[PDB]
Design an enzyme around this catalytic site. Structure first.
Site, PDB file in Angstrom:
ATOM      1  N   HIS A 274      -3.862  16.500 -40.005  1.00 13.23           N
ATOM      2  CA  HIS A 274      -4.775  17.202 -39.110  1.00 13.23           C
ATOM      3  C   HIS A 274      -4.388  17.067 -37.634  1.00 13.23           C
ATOM      4  O   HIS A 274      -5.032  17.642 -36.771  1.00 13.23           O
ATOM      5  CB  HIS A 274      -6.240  16.789 -39.351  1.00 13.23           C
ATOM      6  CG  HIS A 274      -6.576  15.360 -39.035  1.00 13.23           C
ATOM      7  ND1 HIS A 274      -6.499  14.829 -37.765  1.00 13.23           N
ATOM      8  CD2 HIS A 274      -7.075  14.376 -39.821  1.00 13.23           C
ATOM      9  CE1 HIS A 274      -6.903  13.570 -37.790  1.00 13.23           C
ATOM     10  NE2 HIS A 274      -7.259  13.269 -39.026  1.00 13.23           N
TER      11      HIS A 274
ATOM     12  N   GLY B 152      -9.658   8.878 -32.294  1.00 14.72           N
ATOM     13  CA  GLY B 152      -8.388   8.380 -31.788  1.00 14.72           C
ATOM     14  C   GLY B 152      -7.789   7.310 -32.686  1.00 14.72           C
ATOM     15  O   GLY B 152      -6.640   6.901 -32.501  1.00 14.72           O
TER      16      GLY B 152
ATOM     17  N   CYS C 267      -7.345   7.725 -35.937  1.00 13.54           N
ATOM     18  CA  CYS C 267      -6.697   8.309 -37.104  1.00 13.54           C
ATOM     19  C   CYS C 267      -5.232   7.881 -37.154  1.00 13.54           C
ATOM     20  O   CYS C 267      -4.552   7.771 -36.123  1.00 13.54           O
ATOM     21  CB  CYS C 267      -6.821   9.834 -37.093  1.00 13.54           C
ATOM     22  SG  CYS C 267      -8.538  10.327 -37.145  1.00 13.54           S
TER      23      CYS C 267
HETATM   24  O1  LIG Z   1     -10.723  16.100 -32.024  1.00 15.22           O
HETATM   25  C1  LIG Z   1      -9.768  16.723 -32.426  1.00 15.22           C
HETATM   26  N1  LIG Z   1      -9.380  16.739 -33.801  1.00 15.22           N
HETATM   27  C2  LIG Z   1     -10.107  16.060 -34.846  1.00 15.22           C
HETATM   28  C3  LIG Z   1      -9.409  15.600 -35.955  1.00 15.22           C
HETATM   29  C4  LIG Z   1     -10.117  14.961 -36.990  1.00 15.22           C
HETATM   30  C5  LIG Z   1     -11.501  14.822 -36.894  1.00 15.22           C
HETATM   31  N2  LIG Z   1     -12.274  14.206 -37.954  1.00 15.22           N
HETATM   32  C6  LIG Z   1     -12.867  15.076 -38.968  1.00 15.22           C
HETATM   33  C7  LIG Z   1     -11.734  15.942 -39.553  1.00 15.22           C
HETATM   34  C8  LIG Z   1     -10.714  15.487 -40.607  1.00 15.22           C
HETATM   35  C9  LIG Z   1      -9.792  16.557 -40.888  1.00 15.22           C
HETATM   36  S1  LIG Z   1     -10.157  17.852 -39.989  1.00 15.22           S
HETATM   37  C10 LIG Z   1     -11.448  17.303 -39.174  1.00 15.22           C
HETATM   38  C11 LIG Z   1     -12.450  12.792 -37.995  1.00 15.22           C
HETATM   39  O2  LIG Z   1     -13.118  12.311 -38.888  1.00 15.22           O
HETATM   40  C12 LIG Z   1     -11.788  11.951 -36.915  1.00 15.22           C
HETATM   41  N3  LIG Z   1     -12.232  10.602 -37.046  1.00 15.22           N
HETATM   42  N4  LIG Z   1     -11.679   9.669 -37.823  1.00 15.22           N
HETATM   43  N5  LIG Z   1     -12.369   8.529 -37.678  1.00 15.22           N
HETATM   44  C13 LIG Z   1     -13.415   8.737 -36.778  1.00 15.22           C
HETATM   45  C14 LIG Z   1     -14.448   7.913 -36.256  1.00 15.22           C
HETATM   46  C15 LIG Z   1     -15.367   8.448 -35.343  1.00 15.22           C
HETATM   47  C16 LIG Z   1     -15.265   9.784 -34.927  1.00 15.22           C
HETATM   48  C17 LIG Z   1     -14.241  10.599 -35.438  1.00 15.22           C
HETATM   49  C18 LIG Z   1     -13.315  10.059 -36.374  1.00 15.22           C
HETATM   50  C19 LIG Z   1     -12.198  15.308 -35.794  1.00 15.22           C
HETATM   51  C20 LIG Z   1     -11.496  15.936 -34.763  1.00 15.22           C
HETATM   52  C21 LIG Z   1      -8.894  17.540 -31.463  1.00 15.22           C
HETATM   53  C22 LIG Z   1      -7.980  18.573 -31.867  1.00 15.22           C
HETATM   54  C23 LIG Z   1      -7.292  19.157 -30.619  1.00 15.22           C
HETATM   55  C24 LIG Z   1      -7.774  18.483 -29.442  1.00 15.22           C
HETATM   56  S2  LIG Z   1      -8.865  17.363 -29.863  1.00 15.22           S
END
Ligand SMILES: O=C(Nc1ccc(N(Cc2ccsc2)C(=O)Cn2nnc3ccccc32)cc1)c1cccs1
Ligand SMILES: O=C(Nc1ccc(N(Cc2ccsc2)C(=O)Cn2nnc3ccccc32)cc1)c1cccs1
Lengths: 306, 306
Positions: free
Chosen positions: B41, B146, B148
């Protein structure tokens, strides 16, 4: 989100762990520059653990009495060229400086403060966990006798802050050690006699921090309109084995973020101490007092929700 | 003595953490030999997280779309020379082999198993903790945006066994990720939608191991002559959110060392599930189910008391 006991990464400390052997005793040492630190009771024979005369022991050893070995990473046998006591520590000067010595400081932590522990056995790192210095200046850890010399530390900006070297087990699951000035945490002597521990207490400010983490993690059932003044709480605390509460800017910010006042949290402590009423907070049915406000801050930064 | 949540020392893993950036997204990667692993992702724009087309995203990316940097230790900027999909992971090939690649293996852990996590942000290791794979194949960790790409691992004799790469937060304090075959733990997809979690359960064999640990640490008030056979307990378990008990040699060894039968422990579980009644076990008022028999074995090795 989520709140778990977290340790600082141990790599920088792992590079400094050595094995130290004197006679029939072996334990762990910390190699920084040209010095190896270990508990002075490595000098004590099995049959004199009750009343060791460390000055006599010191004098009865030669530099050659101490075998120092590095097992992990770039192996080594280190020659001891001097030995002296620093409080309840032995300071062994060796003829080679540790080339992987990190940038470091020595500090002495206060009751209520947390630190990471690299548990070691016979000169090899075996585990990592986090403890809090209890009110009576003990810690609740997990050790064997061969774990003596295990190292407590914090980290900030690449600098390792060494604060603890494991020395003894006082009672079941209850331990203490020294800072690297050789001063033992608590009213404790390095001998094998029963020693009475001062009564332990719940660290109030840490409990408050934990309740704020709970609220930021969506757990708020314990928050009520009820409030208690700090002056009233503190009188109560003296009779119920809690520490006096003194506010900090960090706590004020958690209050701000959550909309829950410090006086409400102190009231919740009084209520939860009487019973959790079959409910849990962040998975627990007892008050948690080993997260500091700093520890909590590291693990939150979410927005409080509905 | 003592029992704490213990993590494997992280140094060998720290040496393998990098930062990976693709467009506006950045996260952590694992660098072994000429390979860098990271969640796929990283390719997804913030406006397409609910339904990413990862095959299309893959094709739109070039090797130069990916910037890989090591910010700690021997710092480096790594050139990506190939990229391919591996389930919910990207596998990047880089032009330089990680000189500090440890001996390693990959495996996929089962519900009830524990492992260590090195939490990372911007390619910097920040914390170490242990988790247990829950009955519904989630973990209850501590991760922020951040994080991930943060890495889960165990240690098997000077060998690092990589088992987890952090992917997402599912709900408060609830997380999942993939093994390095790219298979997500649990019934979860790497997209930003609400996904149903199957019911979690207490891991019975872990609770039993914890009770045995308690006994070896001098906590035994909960041990009664009452005994409940395995078949009967397993009937009870189906209706009380506990996993079915299946005996192993670990547990058998703990039962022999302590002289207390499984049936006595299963009996105790039933009683404690009803309530601890004001008493505590190892300081807790709830059943603990995230210590495995192996975790307990490593922290015991005293003699059975009275
Ligand atoms: O934010 C961005 N991307 C993002 C990536 C992953 C996430 N996700 C959800 C998800 C999983 C696959 S697709 C969406 C998290 O869980 C991520 N994740 N993973 N652990 C987490 C703990 C707390 C909050 C979030 C957490 C969400 C967003 C940006 C993309 C371009 C600029 S910024
Ligand atoms: O055993 C030996 N020495 C030994 C050293 C320390 C200890 N002690 C008590 C003590 C502290 C100063 S003098 C006696 C521990 O607490 C040690 N300690 N420290 N943490 C422990 C956890 C579990 C058990 C013991 C633990 C006791 C003995 C041997 C000497 C020569 C051959 S063997």
């Amino acid at each position: 989100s989520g709140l778990v006991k977290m340790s600082a990464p141990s790599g920088a400390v792992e590079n400094c762990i050595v094995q130290v052997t004197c006679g029939s005793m072996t334990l762990n040492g910390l190699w920084l520059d040209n010095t190896v630190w270990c508990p002075r009771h490595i000098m004590c024979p099995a049959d004199q653990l009750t009343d060791p005369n460390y000055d006599a022991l010191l004098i009865s050893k030669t530099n050659h009495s101490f075998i120092v070995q590095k097992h992990i990473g770039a192996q080594a046998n280190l020659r001891v060229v001097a030995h002296s006591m620093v409080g309840v520590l032995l300071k062994l000067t060796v003829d080679v400086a540790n080339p992987s010595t990190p940038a470091y400081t020595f500090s002495t932590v206060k009751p209520g403060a947390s630190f990471s522990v690299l548990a070691c056995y016979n000169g090899k790192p075996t585990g990592v966990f986090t403890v809090n210095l209890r009110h009576n200046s003990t810690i609740k850890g997990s050790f064997l006798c061969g774990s003596c010399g295990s190292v407590g530390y914090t980290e900030n900006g690449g600098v390792i802050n060494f604060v603890y070297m494991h020395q003894m087990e006082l009672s079941n699951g209850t331990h203490t050690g020294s800072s690297f000035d050789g001063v033992m945490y608590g009213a404790f002597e390095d001998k094998q006699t029963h020693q009475l521990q001062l009564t332990d207490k719940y660290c109030t400010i840490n409990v408050v921090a934990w309740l704020y983490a709970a609220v930021l993690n969506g757990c708020k059932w314990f928050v009520k309109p009820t409030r208690v003044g700090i002056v009233t709480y503190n009188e109560w605390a003296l009779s119920n084995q809690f520490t006096e509460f003194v506010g900090t800017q960090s706590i004020d910010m958690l209050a701000h973020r959550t909309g829950v006042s410090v006086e409400q949290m102190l009231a919740a402590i009084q209520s939860l101490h009487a019973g959790f009423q079959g409910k849990t907070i962040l998975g627990q049915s007892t008050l948690e007092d080993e997260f500091t406000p700093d520890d909590v801050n590291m693990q939150v930064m979410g927005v409080v929700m509905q």
